[PDB]
Amino acid sequence: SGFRKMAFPSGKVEGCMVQVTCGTTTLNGLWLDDVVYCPRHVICTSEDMLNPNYEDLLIRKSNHNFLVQAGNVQLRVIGHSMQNCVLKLKVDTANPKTPKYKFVRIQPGQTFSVLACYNGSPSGVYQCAMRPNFTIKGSFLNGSCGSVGFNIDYDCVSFCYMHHMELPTGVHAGTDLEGNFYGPFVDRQTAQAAGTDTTITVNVLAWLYAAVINGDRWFLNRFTTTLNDFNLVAMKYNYEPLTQDHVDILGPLSAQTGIAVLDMCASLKELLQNGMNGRTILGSALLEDEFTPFDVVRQCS
Amino acid sequence: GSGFRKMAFPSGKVEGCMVQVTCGTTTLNGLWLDDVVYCPRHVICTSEDMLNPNYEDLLIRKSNHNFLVQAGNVQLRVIGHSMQNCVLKLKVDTANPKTPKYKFVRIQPGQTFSVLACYNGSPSGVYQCAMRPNFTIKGSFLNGSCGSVGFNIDYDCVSFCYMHHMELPTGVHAGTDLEGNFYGPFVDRQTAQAAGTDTTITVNVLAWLYAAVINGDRWFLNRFTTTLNDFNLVAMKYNYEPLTQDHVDILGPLSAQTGIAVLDMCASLKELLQNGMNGRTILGSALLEDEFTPFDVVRQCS
Numbered sequence: 031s032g033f034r035k036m037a038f039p040s041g042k043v044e045g046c047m048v049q050v051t052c053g054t055t056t057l058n059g060l061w062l063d064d065v066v067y068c069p070r071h072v073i074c075t076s077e078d079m080l081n082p083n084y085e086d087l088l089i090r091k092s093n094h095n096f097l098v099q100a101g102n103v104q105l106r107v108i109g110h111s112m113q114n115c116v117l118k119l120k121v122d123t124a125n126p127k128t129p130k131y132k133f134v135r136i137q138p139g140q141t142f143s144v145l146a147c148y149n150g151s152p153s154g155v156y157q158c159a160m161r162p163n164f165t166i167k168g169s170f171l172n173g174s175c176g177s178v179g180f181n182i183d184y185d186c187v188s189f190c191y192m193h194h195m196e197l198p199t200g201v202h203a204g205t206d207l208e209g210n211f212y213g214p215f216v217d218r219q220t221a222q223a224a225g226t227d228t229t230i231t232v233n234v235l236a237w238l239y240a241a242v243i244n245g246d247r248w249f250l251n252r253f254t255t256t257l258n259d260f261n262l263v264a265m266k267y268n269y270e271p272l273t274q275d276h277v278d279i280l281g282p283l284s285a286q287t288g289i290a291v292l293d294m295c296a297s298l299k300e301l302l303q304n305g306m307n308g309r310t311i312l313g314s315a316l317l318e319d320e321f322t323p324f325d326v327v328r329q330c331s
Numbered sequence: 332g333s334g335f336r337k338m339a340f341p342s343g344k345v346e347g348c349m350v351q352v353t354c355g356t357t358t359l360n361g362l363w364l365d366d367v368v369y370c371p372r373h374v375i376c377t378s379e380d381m382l383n384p385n386y387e388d389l390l391i392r393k394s395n396h397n398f399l400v401q402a403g404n405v406q407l408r409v410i411g412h413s414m415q416n417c418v419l420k421l422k423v424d425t426a427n428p429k430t431p432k433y434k435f436v437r438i439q440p441g442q443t444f445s446v447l448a449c450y451n452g453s454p455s456g457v458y459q460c461a462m463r464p465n466f467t468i469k470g471s472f473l474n475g476s477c478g479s480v481g482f483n484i485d486y487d488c489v490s491f492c493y494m495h496h497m498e499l500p501t502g503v504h505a506g507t508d509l510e511g512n513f514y515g516p517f518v519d520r521q522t523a524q525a526a527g528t529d530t531t532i533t534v535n536v537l538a539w540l541y542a543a544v545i546n547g548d549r550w551f552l553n554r555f556t557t558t559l560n561d562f563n564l565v566a567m568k569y570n571y572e573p574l575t576q577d578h579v580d581i582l583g584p585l586s587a588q589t590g591i592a593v594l595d596m597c598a599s600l601k602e603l604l605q606n607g608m609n610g611r612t613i614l615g616s617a618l619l620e621d622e623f624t625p626f627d628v629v630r631q632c633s
């Protein structure tokens with residue numbers, strides 16, 4: 031029993047974190063095999079950061095300009111290249127702690143674990159979702175750039191995020207490990223707004239199932255709805271549409287609880303229309319949308 | 332601000348200590364540090380032993396050769412065994428090369444810690460827990476989770492504070508420190524046990540009010556103060572835990588950061604309890620949070 035946001039164990043990723051310094055800029059890097067991946071703006075000085083012409087800035091650097099430290103050991107940089115918003119530093123030493131890994135671009139609504147790091151040292155681990163507007167609601171301070179997000183499947187680490195930016199609203203923006211931003215953001219020192227965010231409907235439904243599994247049932251009702259009728263209401267409330275694929279993915283939770291997915295939809299419609307009236311679900315005064323169906327099953331057997 | 336979230340400590344130093352301990356068909360998690368493996372003592376129980384085990388008698392029948400300790404699929408030879416309170420200590424013939432700097436600490440109610448939930452010695456996930464005033468934790472633990480540990484990490488030293496043993500009827504969890512002493516009145520037997528009525532963790536609500544002030548959300552501050560005793564007597568009326576002197580002392584850094592004396596913040600909380608929120612929110616919420624400690628707040632604000 032019980033229901034907490036749960037991150038993946040972070041050890042496989044901790045053994046890959048290093049510090050990268052160029053000039054007096056320092057951030058975190060990810061050391062896999064003989065390459066260190068980090069945000070390209072390690073090359074920037076404060077004067078570069080507003081209008082960086084990154085190709086120009088990079089051609090002005092050589093290998094010996096990059097200081098890579100794994101703990102208190104310097105790794106020698108023997109080559110460098112830029113891929114989108116990431117720098118790739120080839121070093122002379124392979125990381126024996128490299129896990130089996132893949133680089134993946136995650137879909138909006140999927141969750142991943144973040145290993146927040148400072149000065150190449152892991153500080154904390156927590157679960158985030160890629161929002162529909164391609165921000166993440168993380169917890170990142172100065173010095174966090176180059177921290178990564180990942181999922182683990184068996185023994186294989188799927189890296190999906192590298193941290194670059196905090197928006198004025200306090201949410202965060204970053205790239206995949208190919209260095210392509212999620213969302214309409216740019217690696218420069220400007221105040222950037224996101225598109226209007228929406229709530230991840232399939233994940234709210236997953237979390238309502240979690241609530242029923244854990245004995246919190248006050249919001250259920252005897253009624254049902256159609257998929258299209260539900261979607262009309264969802265859209266009106268800035269919830270994402272629910273697809274038939276989402277209904278399919280919710281099938282195991284539906285089976286486990288005996289609540290049909292469209293009946294759970296009817297429960298959620300009533301919560302959107304009426305509110306919670308000062309009641310809580312799983313201790314929350316808000317509808318939670320950062321658990322996927324996978325995440326609920328993993329936790330709820 | 333970003334909002335506060337439960338953040339766990341990175342779990343790698345603890346992952347490198349997890350093993351499985353089997354007796355018969357019963358497998359629990361254990362913790363390998365140096366040349367000792369620590370696990371719950373009820374790994375020695377059969378189904379028939381579990382309602383009222385005579386652990387001293389049960390253990391006399393076990394030999395070193397009855398314990399199967401494995402790190403992954405690799406067996407770790409047991410060369411001695413003893414029982415300390417509700418944990419078994421298995422001396423093994425290999426010192427764990429991944430042993431971190433570590434301590435065993437007994438935490439107080441209100442303190443938070445990370446749990447590495449494991450099944451058959453293999454870690455599933457990591458999450459942040461608070462010890463409730465009634466010495467339960469609102470954990471997330473399935474069959475096969477016993478012997479998973481709770482810990483904090485401070486400058487590369489792991490302070491282990493919890494090992495998992497039990498789910499109460501109410502769905503909350505109970506366990507021991509790493510010396511095998513239960514937190515709270517619980518015992519390791521297959522019986523339905525009730526915890527005391529839970530209370531709200533006052534020290535942590537005060538930390539949350541300090542966090543609100545740090546982030547510019549300060550409508551609830553008043554120009555009054557209270558005595559500690561008067562505050563504790565009001566707190567009890569609202570099912571809030573009384574403050575200890577230790578609580579007052581761990582609020583010291585937040586009090587310094589904000590310039591709001593602890594007893595002045597207590598007067599502000601008292602007014603919130605007596606009058607309510609009256610439609611207003613703090614840090615975006617109509618509910619007061621009680622599972623972020625003074626340390627957690629400073630960590631997330633800096």
Ligand SMILES: *[C@@](O)(c1nc2ccccc2s1)[C@H](C[C@@H]1CCNC1=O)NC(=O)[C@H](CC(C)C)NC(=O)c1cc2c(OC)cccc2[nH]1
Pocket residue numbers: 055057069071072074079170171172173174175176194195196197198202216217218219220221222
């Ligand atoms: C990240 O740690 C980096 N810091 C530096 C410092 C020097 C060179 C390069 C980098 S990357 C950092 C993470 C941020 C800090 C606070 N919390 C975070 O998550 N990222 C940045 O500082 C980033 C650098 C860009 C060059 C990519 N800038 C911003 O996030 C940023 C800039 C603004 C801003 O500029 C006028 C206005 C409002 C918001 C804002 N965010």
Ligand SMILES: *[C@@](O)(c1nc2ccccc2s1)[C@H](C[C@@H]1CCNC1=O)NC(=O)[C@H](CC(C)C)NC(=O)c1cc2c(OC)cccc2[nH]1
Pocket residue numbers: 031357359371373374376381472473474475476477478496497498499500504518519520521522523524
């Ligand atoms: C833990 O994983 C263990 N399982 C076994 C199995 C065989 C021998 C020893 C152990 S320890 C397990 C964790 C629980 C399972 C569900 N969620 C959890 O957190 N602990 C127990 O199963 C524990 C064993 C005791 C001997 C300590 N028992 C209980 O938690 C328990 C027993 C009862 C109960 O008995 C009639 C009634 C109500 C509640 C209850 N909880």
